Every structure is written in C-alpha cells, then in structure tokens.
C-alpha cells in the first residue's frame, strides 16, 4: 500500500515528463527530468500540506506569508512518535481492491483462497502477490484505499500492527507499539507532562483529565495505565499519553506537534512552491499547483473518469462514489502467519 | 552462545589509572623482576651493592619518565557546590581538582557522592598545550562535546586568550622543563652505559649531570610559573589554590639523590 | 540531527535510555493500551488511502528505523505468558530491539 | 529594547509572545552597517557637562 503510493508518484512523474516532452519537443533528458521533478515536488507538497494535513488533523496551517530564512525546519524527535502513532492507530486489518465501476473484487491469497480483502499482516514486504500482478491491480489497490474507511483514531491498534509487525531481528513478527515505545525511550523523548508544558498546553493534573470522553465511558484503559505507572502522572511518557489523548482526532499534544512541525517545514524551506523568490514557478503555475488534489493525480495516473473518485480522497462522505461493502475486521480474513 | 544480543551484556571496563604511567611502571617492574631472577647468578658479596645500584638506577629512570609524563606538577583541589550542566538548575557537591603538568592540564570533577542527579560524576579531562597541538581547538571541542560547567570553566581559564595569563607561562614552563627532563634522561642512559665501562669517574660525572639537569628543570618550572599574575579561580563559594604537586617533589628528591650520588662518586674517586 | 522540543530525557542524562523498573515494560504497556476489537470505523470517515499517503509523507520527512553504530540493543523483555510472543509460559522471551 | 529602540527608530517591537527555540538570533552582517551608520549620523561635535 505504501508501495502503491510510491508507484502512483513514480507514474505521475513519468506522465508529467511525457506531457513536457509533448509541449517542448526540443528539450533533452535533463531538462525534462528537472521540470517534471519540480512540478511533482510542488504537487506533492501541496497535497501533503493543504489537503492531507487539514483532513487528518482537522487543523489548517496559517496562511503562507513568505520564506523564513532564520527558522529551523528540522524534524523534532517528538514528531516521529506523534506522526507514527496517529498513523498506526488507523491501519485497517484488511484493504479492499476496487474496480472503476464500484466493484470490489476478491483477493487471491497465497493459500489459493479468495478473500474479501487483502490482509495487511500477510502482505508485509511482499515480493509478489497473486492478486497484485499488473498496473491494474495497483490501480485497484488505490481505488479501494480511496473508498475504504480507516480504523478509529483511538488507543486501539489492530493485531496486524500490535502483534504481527515485521520483526527486524530474529523474529518474523514483533510489537510495533512496543517498538515505538522503545524508540521513544531510545530518542530520550520527554514525559507527557513536560511535552505539554514545552508546547504551551494547559497542564494535566489528573489521570482522567488526559481524555475526559474516554473516562466517561466504561473503558478502563486509563486506570490500568495509571496502575502501570504507579499512579505517577509525571512519569507518563509522550507516546502513551498521545495515544490516550486521541478522540475522533489526534490529541492536542500530537496535533500541536504535527502542526508546528509542518509550519516550520513550510516556512523554513526555500524551495517551497509558494515561495515566489526561488523562481521555481510563476503566479499562474502556483495557482495551478494549488488547484491540484490527490484526486487529480489518481485520475491522471490510473486514467479513469473523475467521477470514479470522491473530490477529497482523504475523506469519504455519503453520496461519494463506490461505498465500501462493510467495515473490515479480522472476521473473514486469512489468519496472520505465525511468528 | 548466541540467540541473544549483545553476546556480552556486561559493562565495559575502564582502565584504573594513567596508561602512560602504568606502562612505565610495568616496563620498569618487568626489568626489576628480570634482574631479581638474575640475582642468584651474581658472584659473591657484590650482590646487595649490585642490587642497590640496579634498583637506584631503575628508580632514577622511572622517576624521570613518570615525572616528565605526569600531569601532577601544580595541583589543587577544592570541595564545593557548583552548577553541573546546561539546561539544568540543579547543583552538585563535588571535589574539583586542577593538575597542571608539562604538556597540559587535567581537570577532575569527582562527585561527593559520585552518584548525583542520577549521573556518574567522575570526570578527568585533559587539555594539552604541547607544541603542534592547539589548546583553543581542544577547548572548542570540549564546548561542543558538552563537558560539565566546572570543567569548562577551568579549561577556559587556561585558554591563550583568557585575561589571566596562565596559558603562556605554563606552556613555556612545561615545554622547557620537559626538554631538560629529556636531557636528564639522556644523561641517565649515558651514566648507565659509562658505569658499564671501566671509567667510573666519567659515569659519576654523567650522573651528576642528570641531577643538575633535574634541578635545572625544577628551578625553571618554579621561576616560570611564579611570574604569573594571580589568576583567581573561583568555583561556587570557594577559591582554588594551586601548589607544587608530588611531581615537583619527586623531581626535587630524585635530583638531590642524583647530585648526592655523583658528588659521592667524585669524592670517593679523588680519595681512592 | 533531529530537533528537540524538550531536553533529552535519559537515565544517565547523556545517552542511556530510561527503562524498567522506573518505566513500565513496553509489552505490558502495549497490551494494556492497544488491545481492543478491530473494525471500529473512523469517526471522521478518514480513508485508508489517506493513512498510507501519510505514511509516504513520513517516509519523505523522517527515517530513524535503521540501526546505528556501534550496535546497541535495547531489548524488549516479553512478560511471561504473553499470548503472542511467549505462549509456552517460558518466561525468558526477549524481543530484540 | 523597550525604551531606546522605540525612541531611536520610531518603531516598536511586537508584543512578546514567548520564547522561540527554533529562531536564529545571530547578528546579521547588514545590521552592523545599519546600526553603526544610524548611530554615527547623530554624533555631535561636542558634548556638554
């Protein structure tokens, strides 16, 4: 699926190179490659910052006011954990493969069985898959991911991530959340309270104030987590606190981290496509890039009618084309390969 | 055995002392052990005198080498409460020691107790001003490294540009004291070689020269380190005072022993 | 190097990570927090395509997964009787990290 | 910052909104010339006591 995204961007670059070759027949290889790379980078930045971020944070960057040469844009250590966790909390147990005519095809397993969707845990580092053989299969992957709803933005992880993540050493499987916790301890990440204080967030003094709606319900995860920490809120780590904070959105800590990191990335970059001083694009080219969404990239690469995809492929709404058959769970999918 | 990482999970050892001094001690103790093994092969009554001669010569050579390489000429040590690191307002109670040698200075920061603020405070940092080595570069690398505040303070106190001129005088003193100590070592080698030869009076003269050069190095170090304008080293609520360390006194004692033995050799030759 | 919002939190204050017994076991914390039923739809109807596009963005931005040198291991001690990694109650299973 | 600068620039700093850890505060090369010249243009021939 990450591979499908990479293939999408690779084919988009090739398509832009072909377009520029059509427009400028006299251009050589280097000129075509550089112009296509510039355009693709601009489109990627626009989609990532002005379309994906507002949809997956419910927060928008402030209006671009120019290039800040004195602003450090380096990725913060907290951003790694925040982004990784608020993405891992939404990984589905399976992924649909969808036709351009709103038809969800069956997925041929390596066990020769036909499943309703492609199981995530059994597709890690897949050298080859029987249902993934041609460009049409990758297009089906992209369409199905566009039509399928992700998992809930909560503390719960699917077993494909929590138990069957690719083990990098001596085990074919490992816990991705435990690995992320050990990464946060490895990077010397701050405590949850210190992280909140450094970002200007309001201090949290009680364990039930981490997520009021979570403590309202019958879920006992807050009390159990406090028991693990010996009721010491000052020892709660940034990553578990960000996991617990999330409710319908990344928590205030994680949302603040990601938003501030992306603000610094946009403002501190001299090659940002909106920075008119770098000479990358004219005003008209900047306006064209701003008008380009991921739906445009998918339509251009897959070469299908625009009505086959919703206008904002990052969010599915009632009335959008090709609804998913049902919310995927572990039921009906192949069992994950044992460690 | 495998299946676990790392294969060796134990803490890695740290050498318990200076490696140069340890090597000198090992070499000269090996020579002493060899000559002790050889001792029964010595002929007759001239064994205790032979033992004294051999042990004295080896001690003179070891003293020359160790003192020339010891950073223990000007020593000082004060127990204080001082700020420890950056981005931390907590203070540490520690012994801060300055050990200025011929080629540089060792700054020691030993916690009392060593385990303070969940950290091991047993720093022993060297900053060298030897010829060809840039002291300012070493201090800049220490600043980039992030050494604790007392270490950085005492290191910048010896920078070439520091208002108190410790660097210039101490570099000059150490350089010429080391040169004369090397001359004394050469004279000691020649003293051994010419005590092997039948002309004992010339060997006694060379031993006397060894003593004279040791005394000259001592006097030059004293005079060149005395010309310093008073640099007040203030840590916390205390002031650190330096004084002639045990390297200075070992130089004095070894030089006096060498000059006394040389004078005794010359007077005995004149009287016999 | 990566930036820091807060000064680094290490056991020795330099490089040694904070771990047990001061902090809970990573696998215990993972089991306590992340165990739950799959199939809970996103409350904003966020799509899977968006999730993996964000993964692509992260791969574009940061990468701290490849190990460093010299090889240092911060191994995850599996609690005894873990249903997934220690099903035989052997009690010495260790996930290498 | 809050008395000399407003009086000698007729410009005021924006309201202080906190510490910016990611902002480079290093003196720019242009600032040397700018400050030195707008100060040197006002040096009097003499000074009263």
């Amino acid at each position: 699926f990450l591979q499908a995204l990479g293939l999408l961007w690779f084919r988009y670059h090739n398509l832009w190179a072909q377009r520029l070759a059509r427009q400028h027949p006299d251009w050589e290889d280097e000129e075509l490659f550089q112009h296509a790379r510039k355009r693709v980078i601009a489109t990627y930045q626009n989609i990532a910052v002005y379309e994906w971020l507002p949809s997956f944070l419910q927060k928008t960057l402030p209006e671009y006011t120019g290039y800040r040469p004195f602003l450090d844009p380096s990725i913060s250590s907290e951003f790694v954990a925040a982004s990784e966790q608020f993405l891992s909390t939404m990984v589905p147990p399976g992924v649909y493969m969808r036709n351009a005519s709103c038809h969800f095809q069956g997925v041929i397993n390596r066990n020769s069985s036909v499943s309703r969707a492609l199981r995530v845990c059994n597709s890690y580092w897949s050298r080859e898959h029987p249902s993934l053989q041609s460009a049409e299969d990758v297009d089906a992957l992209l369409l199905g991911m566009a039509s399928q709803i992700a998992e809930r933005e909560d503390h719960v992880l699917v077993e494909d991530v929590r138990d069957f993540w690719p083990g990098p050493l001596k085990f074919s499987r490992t816990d991705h959340l435990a690995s992320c916790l050990q990464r946060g301890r490895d990077l010397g990440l701050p405590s949850y309270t210190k992280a909140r204080a450094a970002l200007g967030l309001s201090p949290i003094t009680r364990w039930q104030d981490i997520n009021p709606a979570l403590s309202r319900s019958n879920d006992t995860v807050l009390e159990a987590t406090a028991a693990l920490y010996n009721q010491d809120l000052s020892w709660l780590e940034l990553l578990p606190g960000g996991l617990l904070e999330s409710h319908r959105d990344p928590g205030p800590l994680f949302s603040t981290i990601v938003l501030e990191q992306f603000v610094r990335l946009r403002d501190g970059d001299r090659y940002w496509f909106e920075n008119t001083r770098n000479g990358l694009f004219s005003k008209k080219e900047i306006e064209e890039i701003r008008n380009t969404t991921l739906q445009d990239v998918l339509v251009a690469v897959i070469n299908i009618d625009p009505s086959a995809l919703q206008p904002n492929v990052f969010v599915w709404h009632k009335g959008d084309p090709c609804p998913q058959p049902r919310q995927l769970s572990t039921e009906g999918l192949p069992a994950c390969a044992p460690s | 055995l495998g299946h676990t990482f790392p294969f060796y999970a134990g803490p890695k050892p740290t050498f318990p002392m200076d490696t140069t001094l340890a090597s000198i001690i090992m070499i000269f103790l090996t020579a002493l052990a060899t000559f002790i093994v050889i001792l029964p092969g010595i002929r007759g009554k001239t064994r205790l005198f032979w033992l004294l001669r051999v042990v004295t010569s080896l001690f003179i050579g070891a003293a020359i080498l160790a003192v020339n390489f010891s950073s223990e000429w000007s020593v000082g040590q004060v127990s204080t409460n001082t700020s420890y690191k950056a981005f931390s307002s907590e203070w540490i109670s520690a012994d801060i020691g300055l050990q200025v040698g011929l080629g540089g200075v060792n700054i020691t920061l030993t916690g009392t107790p060593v385990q303070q603020l969940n950290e091991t405070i047993n720093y022993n940092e060297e900053f060298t001003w030897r010829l060809g080595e840039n002291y300012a570069e070493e201090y800049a690398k220490a600043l980039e490294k992030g050494l604790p505040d007392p270490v950085l303070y005492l290191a910048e106190k010896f920078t070439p540009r520091s208002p108190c001129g410790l660097y210039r005088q101490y570099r000059l003193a150490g350089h010429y004291t080391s040169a004369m100590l090397w001359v004394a070592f050469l004279c000691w080698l020649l003293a051994n070689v010419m005590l092997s030869m039948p002309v004992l009076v010339y060997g006694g003269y060379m031993l006397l020269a060894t003593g004279i050069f040791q005394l000259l190095a001592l006097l030059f170090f004293s005079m060149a380190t005395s010309l310093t304008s008073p640099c007040p080293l203030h840590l916390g609520a205390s002031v650190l005072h330096t004084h002639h360390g045990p390297a200075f006194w070992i130089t004095l004692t070894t030089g006096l022993l060498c000059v006394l033995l040389g004078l005794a050799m010359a007077v005995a030759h004149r009287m016999q | 190097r990566l930036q820091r919002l807060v000064p680094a939190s290490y056991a020795d204050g330099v490089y040694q990570p904070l771990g047990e017994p001061h902090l809970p076991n990573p696998r215990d914390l993972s089991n306590t927090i992340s165990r739950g039923p799959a199939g809970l739809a996103s409350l904003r109807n966020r799509t899977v395509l968006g999730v993996f596009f964000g993964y692509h963005v992260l791969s574009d931005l940061v990468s701290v997964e490849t190990p460093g040198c010299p090889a240092e291991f911060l191994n995850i001690r599996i609690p005894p009787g873990d249903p997934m990694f220690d099903p035989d109650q052997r009690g010495d299973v260790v996930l290498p990290f | 910052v809050y008395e000399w600068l407003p009086s000698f620039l007729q410009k005021t700093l924006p309201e202080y909104t906190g510490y910016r850890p990611f902002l480079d505060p290093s003196i720019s090369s242009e600032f040397v010339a700018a400050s030195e010249q707008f100060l040197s243009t006002m040096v009097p021939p003499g000074v009263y006591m």
Binding site: - | F87, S89, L143 | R1, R4 | -
Partner: peptide, 28 residues
C-alpha cells in the same frame, strides 16, 4: 536552600539555544 534557584546564564553565550549551542556565542 540555594539562593541561586535558576540556571546561571553563561558569559560566552553558549548553551542558550537547546539544539544550536553555538547560536549567539562568542566567535560565531
């Protein structure tokens, strides 16, 4: 209790910024 309850500012401008220790320092 120590009257100096804060982290004393360095004279050379080092360690003022958390990640850029040379910022504002002497010689930069």
């Amino acid at each position: 209790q120590n009257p100096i309850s804060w982290e004393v500012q360095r004279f050379d401008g080092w360690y003022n910024n958390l990640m850029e220790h040379r910022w504002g320092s002497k010689g930069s």
